[PDB]
């Protein structure tokens, strides 16, 4: 849990990447909070080929799946944290919803497969990093 496994790729929040992720690095983007590493096993997930703006994600802090409506991906100014300085984060989709420390990594899904992964939140919002344009994963 906390990652998307598609083909021979593992997709994780960049800020949560492991040593083994970096050893097997395929691609990373700080402005998206995304990192993709190589795997030895084939993954089970599918990347949604769609423009759905409703779906379900897993919330780690509640151990529950929740339905969610979220904005189209956008450039969003995200305030400083112990993970990044204040910056523009692109590809970020916002929903009203619960979040707490440790929720980053929860996978957002629709009928077409994986849509994104929890990256940010606060002030009553949850921000998901969209992955649907990374067509090279699938």
């Amino acid at each position: 849990s906390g990652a998307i496994y598609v083909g021979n790729f593992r997709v994780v929040n960049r800020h949560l990447a492991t040593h083994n992720d970096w050893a097997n690095l395929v691609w990373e983007d700080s402005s998206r909070d995304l990192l993709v590493s190589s795997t030895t096993a084939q993954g089970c997930d599918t990347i949604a080929r769609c423009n759905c703006q409703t779906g379900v994600y897993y919330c780690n802090s509640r151990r529950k799946h929740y339905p969610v409506s979220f904005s189209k991906p956008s450039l969003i100014y995200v305030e400083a944290s112990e993970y990044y300085p204040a910056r523009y984060q692109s590809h970020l989709m916002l929903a009203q919803g619960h979040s707490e420390p440790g929720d980053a990594g929860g996978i957002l899904r629709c009928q077409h497969g994986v849509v994104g992964i929890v990256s940010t939140g606060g002030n009553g919002l949850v921000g998901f990093a969209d992955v649907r344009d990374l067509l090279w994963l699938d």
Partner: peptide, 4 residues
């Protein structure tokens, strides 16, 4: 960006 989260990861707490």
């Amino acid at each position: 960006t989260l990861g707490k």
